[PDB]
């Protein structure tokens, strides 16, 4: 069921800067042509962002377990749909319930169960040289899923699993918070054209979903897909992601004429 | 460090500062005021009202 | 008379008094609720064959329905009913957004723990409400359903835990609790405990030990699109008039007009600088409407002394007069920079000023005066 | 000189600006809760019955009265300063102009 | 207008201390009167044109 | 045994730890109300007389 | 500092009417400015030393 | 929290009144100082120069 | 301390409490001393935050350089947010982020106690 992947190199973690990223619409009220002050958890401006890689070249396939703390800012720069989803929980084994949110390329599945997760979870796509096709071939992630209390499955779709050459073209940003039983997700999708780290700019994320989960989340793990032609027989593709943490902050938000947040001030950044 | 050391002192100035009450300095110092006064006196004695 | 009441006098001397503001009244009311035809699943929530154990409480989403509570009047009887963020009498005029029903069985002496701010084995280890709770807690005796002669042991609660639960947290693990110094790798004796216990529910137990069914309805009000509404009848939408209204439970008075504001898909209401609703998305036609207050002001009264005459002139500061938002006309209408003055004759002769009006204009009482 | 240096008339511009700011402040202050569950009377009345709504409304009324009282007090103080300036101007008209 | 915004229930409660509003307006009216007076003292010194 | 209400008993409690959880596996109370302190704060406090 | 004393819960409640504090400081700042201005008008009349 | 909030709001309102009273008194006193400073400036011009 | 919470700096005290006194209070009736429950030592409590900060700003339409004045810092671990050189000490406080110039000029942005600042030239 589970596979322990090998043949990876050893690099220190990379770091980048968050600039002005991580702002989301704090409410569901239309406002326009106004400055508004709010106090939610936010990614602080110009904060320390940990940079993780999936590269083939110095092979890396970074999918570590990270702390969740008070909430997470997550971002991804991709060309070929490598990052599929996340695991949230505490012990991440069949002692406690945990949340699994995964895009498996045919549907999107959200489950809350006493999952026994793999110690190196992944998904994967096999390339058929014959007739040039990219197909889902593997789903590991867990060995068991007992006592499920929440479940959602999306309508069917077909993901483009083709490997790509070129720069990163898709920036996806998410904010994850766990408050009074709800797992709150905010998101934004921005087109990009970049070759290294998280791009500069400003965009506010919109609410996506409030999930009635009811569990304790202290750690989380990112699920990446593999490419194949086995613990050594694999290709890392190409993709990168960034993780930051939210802290209570006061922000001055600027709403333009059409009610879009176009700018902001982090009131705790400095004396100016 | 002066307000932290001298606690037994019960200094009213520290009590005010710890509660957010601050006294700001004047822009003109006493030395500067004395210079303006001296100029006016020197002027008067030397040239009267002119 | 408004001047006389303000001054607490039956006599008013010569001069100009400000007199409130021009106001208009609403003429009709508008009620706009989403066109929901389904009745809410009261049967499924309150008439269920089985309820969950409190340690593993159930949660169900309620949506796209009418919250007509009266259907329970010919069936259910509740010993406990309390609402926290809304008055009970207002429930039928409102719409609700994320409505969930939590469901479980506890003892009668534990019913008091299902409340914000409580402690005890249920409040601390099985089910907890937030202090900032909007919703209603409903409970009733189920001794004739959940009790058995030899004891109904199918309902469990958590007795042992290392830390307290957070609001709306569920914990269904069965790991052995360590009360002492022993690691408790299994063992389950000495100072090691299985964390859950059963309730011995029997028909002969005293009331404090009889089972109670508890339903908790969690919801949010007036800030987002709603899918569950009370039993109100929608009316037609009336524009460009002063009307009273109710949009998804939010009431007010004002003038509704078409708007050019573009709300994001999740935005139902808009607000101004004073955080007052100034726009809504109509529930049936998804049109954005702007709301303008009915009353806009600008009124003062020019008075000769009342010991001379009772003729007055009224100045409307914001009326152009060139259906004028005035109380009356009756000719003698003169327009100046200070407003539309009604009730005074304009004279082409200049005189010294007596009662100043403003912007170069004065008034006086003169001759048949 | 007057055309060249726009700051020359700052003394008159300041009067205009101060009064405008004071009125805009009163409007902005309407958004304050003052201990109430909501700054909007309609939210209070849409959700609460009379005896509960009354508590929340009294909190807002007291706060709103303080905002107006603060405004009036500041206008009286400023007016006194204007009066002094006007008296100076009147003296100058009599002694410098006539 | 400022306090209640045409809400009837608020207006009826506001009446509990209506002497306050009257007093606020006496103060503002007095200011308005002085502003016209100040203008005349500075400029209308000579009534011969 | 408990005392008659007309001649109610009174006992001094001192030099101990107020761990109320010991009652969870035994007692069941139909009534419980605190007046000068919130129930949730009892475990963080010390008491005098 | 004056009102809450670094208590976090108070600070978060104080924010319900934070426009008030800003207004109090605008008033005090204006006074501070005048005090330096008053000093110059009385003494710095002649800039020739 | 929900009980503490009531008690804290009572203190915040009172603390704000103390600061507002202070500021109002400083503004009144400052006006008196300004008048004295203007007198002094006049004397400098007319008595000293 | 025995259920009474707070934030502050604890130091040894010379206050002598009577046998029945557990807490001491200041003029504002705020606890400013406690008797430790295990070692019967009297400790004084001093608030952590002591103030004195202001910011000197060229217009933001010109530059984003600012200087920060610490009114109660001597600078001669300074209770400042940062240093970065350009540290000048005056009677009005420790000014960090400005170059001291020996030339006198007319005043532009007043700081206090005879000191003014301006934005001048590579400005
Ligand atoms: C959420 O999970 C964490 C991690 O399991 C819990 O924190 C532990 O609590 C035990 C008991 O007090 C301590 O011995 C551990 O040292 C704690 N671990 C960490 C990393 O803090 C936490 O209590 C859980 N939350 C709830 C509400 O139960
Ligand atoms: C991978 O190795 C870890 C020990 O480092 C072990 O816990 C885990 O179960 C192994 N998984 C597989 C599939 O061998
Ligand atoms: C945090 O950012 C700094 C640069 O400001 C960098 O030197 C450092 O390595 C980063 N991360 C950590 C964990 O120190
Ligand atoms: C994705 O998940 C759904 C629901 O569990 C399942 O029916 C489907 O076969 C899965 N697709 C793949 C490629 O594994
Ligand atoms: C390509 O060939 C492989 C091997 O025979 C087969 O499994 C795969 O289904 C084929 N591709 C498509 C699109 O059917
Ligand atoms: C607002 O939207 C309109 C189109 O409806 C567009 O023309 C205008 O430029 C937008 N304004 C801003 C500030 O983006
Ligand atoms: C529960 O079932 C009874 C019939 O046994 C029925 O009369 C009653 O109306 C039902 N209750 C609800 C809420 O539907
Ligand atoms: C959890 O799983 C166990 C079996 O391991 C089962 O007996 C129990 O009923 C399940 N559900 C809950 C809520 O404990
Ligand atoms: C029913 O709801 C739809 C969708 O909101 C709306 O378009 C339609 O006009 C409504 N119906 C009436 C008046 O029957
Ligand atoms: C009233 O409206 C007319 C246009 O119909 C305009 O010329 C006149 O100036 C307006 N009156 C005032 C006092 O502004
Ligand atoms: C126990 O209490 C005594 C008396 O207050 C004290 O002197 C002693 O240090 C305490 N004990 C420890 C740390 O064991
Ligand atoms: C700073 O401390 C020194 C002693 O190290 C003292 O001479 C100097 O006057 C102090 N600075 C100020 C502004 O008081």
Short mmCIF file of N, CA, C and O in Angstrom, two decimals, chain C residues 218-282:
data_model
loop_
_atom_site.label_atom_id
_atom_site.label_comp_id
_atom_site.label_asym_id
_atom_site.label_seq_id
_atom_site.Cartn_x
_atom_site.Cartn_y
_atom_site.Cartn_z
N UNK C 218 -27.26 25.73 15.37
CA UNK C 218 -26.24 26.76 15.22
C UNK C 218 -26.48 27.52 13.95
O UNK C 218 -26.74 26.93 12.90
N UNK C 219 -26.42 28.83 14.02
CA UNK C 219 -26.66 29.66 12.84
C UNK C 219 -26.05 31.05 12.90
O UNK C 219 -25.52 31.48 13.91
N UNK C 220 -26.05 31.72 11.75
CA UNK C 220 -25.58 33.10 11.69
C UNK C 220 -26.66 33.97 11.06
O UNK C 220 -27.44 33.51 10.21
N UNK C 221 -26.75 35.22 11.49
CA UNK C 221 -27.78 36.12 10.99
C UNK C 221 -27.32 37.44 10.37
O UNK C 221 -26.43 38.09 10.88
N UNK C 222 -28.02 37.83 9.30
CA UNK C 222 -27.95 39.12 8.60
C UNK C 222 -26.63 39.57 7.95
O UNK C 222 -26.49 40.75 7.63
N UNK C 223 -25.69 38.68 7.70
CA UNK C 223 -24.45 39.11 7.05
C UNK C 223 -24.07 38.40 5.75
O UNK C 223 -23.04 38.69 5.16
N UNK C 224 -24.86 37.45 5.30
CA UNK C 224 -24.45 36.68 4.15
C UNK C 224 -25.70 36.09 3.51
O UNK C 224 -26.76 36.15 4.14
N UNK C 225 -25.65 35.60 2.27
CA UNK C 225 -26.77 35.00 1.59
C UNK C 225 -27.34 33.88 2.43
O UNK C 225 -26.59 33.05 2.95
N UNK C 226 -28.65 33.84 2.53
CA UNK C 226 -29.32 32.85 3.35
C UNK C 226 -30.06 31.84 2.52
O UNK C 226 -30.50 32.14 1.41
N UNK C 227 -30.17 30.62 3.06
CA UNK C 227 -30.87 29.54 2.38
C UNK C 227 -32.02 28.96 3.20
O UNK C 227 -32.85 28.23 2.66
N UNK C 228 -32.07 29.26 4.48
CA UNK C 228 -33.13 28.77 5.34
C UNK C 228 -33.87 30.00 5.79
O UNK C 228 -33.22 30.90 6.30
N UNK C 229 -35.19 30.10 5.58
CA UNK C 229 -35.99 31.28 5.96
C UNK C 229 -37.22 30.94 6.73
O UNK C 229 -37.76 29.86 6.60
N UNK C 230 -37.70 31.88 7.54
CA UNK C 230 -38.95 31.67 8.24
C UNK C 230 -40.10 31.74 7.24
O UNK C 230 -39.91 32.08 6.07
N UNK C 231 -41.33 31.49 7.69
CA UNK C 231 -42.55 31.42 6.91
C UNK C 231 -43.15 32.77 6.54
O UNK C 231 -44.27 33.07 6.94
N UNK C 232 -42.42 33.57 5.79
CA UNK C 232 -42.93 34.88 5.38
C UNK C 232 -43.38 34.85 3.95
O UNK C 232 -42.86 34.09 3.14
N UNK C 233 -44.35 35.69 3.63
CA UNK C 233 -44.81 35.79 2.26
C UNK C 233 -44.21 36.97 1.54
O UNK C 233 -44.40 38.12 1.94
N UNK C 234 -43.50 36.70 0.46
CA UNK C 234 -42.88 37.76 -0.31
C UNK C 234 -43.95 38.59 -1.00
O UNK C 234 -44.99 38.08 -1.41
N UNK C 235 -43.63 39.86 -1.16
CA UNK C 235 -44.46 40.85 -1.83
C UNK C 235 -43.75 41.30 -3.07
O UNK C 235 -42.66 40.82 -3.39
N UNK C 236 -44.38 42.21 -3.78
CA UNK C 236 -43.79 42.79 -4.96
C UNK C 236 -42.76 43.79 -4.51
O UNK C 236 -42.77 44.23 -3.36
N UNK C 237 -41.82 44.08 -5.40
CA UNK C 237 -40.77 45.04 -5.14
C UNK C 237 -41.17 46.40 -5.68
O UNK C 237 -41.51 46.53 -6.86
N UNK C 238 -41.17 47.40 -4.82
CA UNK C 238 -41.56 48.74 -5.20
C UNK C 238 -40.39 49.68 -5.18
O UNK C 238 -39.78 49.89 -4.14
N UNK C 239 -40.11 50.28 -6.33
CA UNK C 239 -38.96 51.16 -6.47
C UNK C 239 -39.36 52.63 -6.56
O UNK C 239 -40.48 52.95 -6.95
N UNK C 240 -38.40 53.49 -6.22
CA UNK C 240 -38.47 54.95 -6.28
C UNK C 240 -39.57 55.58 -5.43
O UNK C 240 -40.12 56.62 -5.79
N UNK C 241 -39.86 54.97 -4.30
CA UNK C 241 -40.84 55.45 -3.34
C UNK C 241 -40.25 55.25 -1.97
O UNK C 241 -39.32 54.45 -1.85
N UNK C 242 -40.78 55.95 -0.93
CA UNK C 242 -40.37 55.70 0.45
C UNK C 242 -41.19 54.53 0.97
O UNK C 242 -42.42 54.58 1.04
N UNK C 243 -40.49 53.45 1.26
CA UNK C 243 -41.10 52.21 1.67
C UNK C 243 -40.44 51.62 2.89
O UNK C 243 -39.28 51.91 3.21
N UNK C 244 -41.15 50.74 3.55
CA UNK C 244 -40.54 49.97 4.61
C UNK C 244 -40.11 48.69 3.95
O UNK C 244 -40.73 48.27 2.98
N UNK C 245 -39.12 48.04 4.48
CA UNK C 245 -38.73 46.79 3.87
C UNK C 245 -38.09 45.79 4.80
O UNK C 245 -37.61 46.11 5.88
N UNK C 246 -38.09 44.55 4.31
CA UNK C 246 -37.44 43.38 4.90
C UNK C 246 -36.76 42.53 3.82
O UNK C 246 -37.44 41.87 3.04
N UNK C 247 -35.42 42.59 3.74
CA UNK C 247 -34.69 41.77 2.76
C UNK C 247 -33.94 40.68 3.50
O UNK C 247 -33.01 40.95 4.25
N UNK C 248 -34.40 39.46 3.35
CA UNK C 248 -33.84 38.30 4.05
C UNK C 248 -33.75 38.51 5.56
O UNK C 248 -32.78 38.07 6.18
N UNK C 249 -34.72 39.15 6.16
CA UNK C 249 -34.72 39.37 7.58
C UNK C 249 -34.18 40.73 8.00
O UNK C 249 -34.41 41.14 9.14
N UNK C 250 -33.53 41.46 7.11
CA UNK C 250 -33.00 42.76 7.50
C UNK C 250 -33.97 43.85 7.20
O UNK C 250 -34.29 44.12 6.03
N UNK C 251 -34.43 44.52 8.24
CA UNK C 251 -35.42 45.54 8.04
C UNK C 251 -34.85 46.93 7.92
O UNK C 251 -33.72 47.19 8.33
N UNK C 252 -35.67 47.84 7.43
CA UNK C 252 -35.31 49.24 7.34
C UNK C 252 -36.35 50.06 6.59
O UNK C 252 -37.39 49.54 6.19
N UNK C 253 -36.09 51.35 6.46
CA UNK C 253 -36.96 52.29 5.77
C UNK C 253 -36.12 53.06 4.78
O UNK C 253 -35.00 53.45 5.11
N UNK C 254 -36.61 53.26 3.57
CA UNK C 254 -35.83 54.01 2.60
C UNK C 254 -36.39 53.96 1.20
O UNK C 254 -37.47 53.45 0.95
N UNK C 255 -35.63 54.50 0.27
CA UNK C 255 -35.99 54.55 -1.12
C UNK C 255 -35.07 53.61 -1.88
O UNK C 255 -33.85 53.73 -1.79
N UNK C 256 -35.65 52.67 -2.61
CA UNK C 256 -34.88 51.68 -3.34
C UNK C 256 -34.73 52.07 -4.80
O UNK C 256 -35.72 52.39 -5.46
N UNK C 257 -33.50 52.05 -5.30
CA UNK C 257 -33.26 52.38 -6.72
C UNK C 257 -32.32 51.36 -7.34
O UNK C 257 -31.58 50.68 -6.63
N UNK C 258 -32.26 51.30 -8.66
CA UNK C 258 -31.30 50.41 -9.31
C UNK C 258 -29.88 50.85 -9.03
O UNK C 258 -29.59 52.04 -9.07
N UNK C 259 -28.99 49.89 -8.81
CA UNK C 259 -27.60 50.20 -8.54
C UNK C 259 -26.63 49.68 -9.57
O UNK C 259 -26.89 48.70 -10.26
N UNK C 260 -25.49 50.36 -9.67
CA UNK C 260 -24.42 49.95 -10.55
C UNK C 260 -23.30 49.22 -9.80
O UNK C 260 -22.25 48.95 -10.37
N UNK C 261 -23.53 48.94 -8.52
CA UNK C 261 -22.53 48.25 -7.71
C UNK C 261 -22.47 46.80 -8.12
O UNK C 261 -23.50 46.16 -8.32
N UNK C 262 -21.27 46.26 -8.23
CA UNK C 262 -21.14 44.86 -8.60
C UNK C 262 -20.63 44.05 -7.44
O UNK C 262 -19.45 44.14 -7.10
N UNK C 263 -21.52 43.30 -6.84
CA UNK C 263 -21.18 42.50 -5.68
C UNK C 263 -20.49 41.23 -6.13
O UNK C 263 -20.81 40.69 -7.19
N UNK C 264 -19.56 40.75 -5.33
CA UNK C 264 -18.91 39.49 -5.60
C UNK C 264 -19.96 38.44 -5.31
O UNK C 264 -20.91 38.72 -4.58
N UNK C 265 -19.87 37.22 -5.85
CA UNK C 265 -20.85 36.16 -5.68
C UNK C 265 -21.26 35.85 -4.24
O UNK C 265 -22.39 35.45 -4.00
N UNK C 266 -20.36 36.05 -3.28
CA UNK C 266 -20.64 35.76 -1.89
C UNK C 266 -21.15 36.94 -1.07
O UNK C 266 -21.38 36.80 0.13
N UNK C 267 -21.29 38.10 -1.70
CA UNK C 267 -21.71 39.30 -1.00
C UNK C 267 -23.20 39.57 -1.18
O UNK C 267 -23.69 39.69 -2.30
N UNK C 268 -23.92 39.67 -0.07
CA UNK C 268 -25.37 39.92 -0.07
C UNK C 268 -25.78 41.35 0.24
O UNK C 268 -26.83 41.83 -0.22
N UNK C 269 -24.98 42.02 1.05
CA UNK C 269 -25.29 43.36 1.52
C UNK C 269 -24.08 44.23 1.28
O UNK C 269 -22.96 43.71 1.31
N UNK C 270 -24.28 45.52 1.10
CA UNK C 270 -23.18 46.46 1.06
C UNK C 270 -23.37 47.47 2.17
O UNK C 270 -24.49 47.66 2.63
N UNK C 271 -22.29 48.11 2.60
CA UNK C 271 -22.35 49.11 3.66
C UNK C 271 -21.54 50.36 3.37
O UNK C 271 -20.50 50.29 2.71
N UNK C 272 -21.99 51.49 3.91
CA UNK C 272 -21.34 52.79 3.77
C UNK C 272 -20.27 53.04 4.83
O UNK C 272 -19.87 52.14 5.58
N UNK C 273 -19.77 54.27 4.88
CA UNK C 273 -18.71 54.69 5.79
C UNK C 273 -19.08 54.59 7.27
O UNK C 273 -18.20 54.62 8.13
N UNK C 274 -20.37 54.58 7.57
CA UNK C 274 -20.91 54.52 8.91
C UNK C 274 -21.34 53.10 9.23
O UNK C 274 -22.03 52.86 10.23
N UNK C 275 -20.97 52.18 8.35
CA UNK C 275 -21.25 50.76 8.37
C UNK C 275 -22.75 50.49 8.34
O UNK C 275 -23.22 49.49 8.89
N UNK C 276 -23.49 51.32 7.62
CA UNK C 276 -24.92 51.18 7.50
C UNK C 276 -25.26 50.64 6.14
O UNK C 276 -24.69 51.07 5.14
N UNK C 277 -26.15 49.67 6.09
CA UNK C 277 -26.48 49.06 4.82
C UNK C 277 -26.94 50.11 3.85
O UNK C 277 -27.81 50.92 4.17
N UNK C 278 -26.35 50.12 2.65
CA UNK C 278 -26.75 51.10 1.66
C UNK C 278 -27.02 50.44 0.32
O UNK C 278 -27.22 51.13 -0.68
N UNK C 279 -27.00 49.12 0.31
CA UNK C 279 -27.27 48.35 -0.88
C UNK C 279 -27.59 46.92 -0.52
O UNK C 279 -26.99 46.36 0.40
N UNK C 280 -28.48 46.31 -1.29
CA UNK C 280 -28.80 44.89 -1.13
C UNK C 280 -28.89 44.16 -2.45
O UNK C 280 -29.24 44.74 -3.47
N UNK C 281 -28.69 42.85 -2.41
CA UNK C 281 -28.96 42.03 -3.57
C UNK C 281 -30.35 41.41 -3.46
O UNK C 281 -30.62 40.62 -2.55
N UNK C 282 -31.25 41.75 -4.35
CA UNK C 282 -32.60 41.22 -4.22
C UNK C 282 -32.56 39.68 -4.25
O UNK C 282 -31.80 39.11 -5.03
#
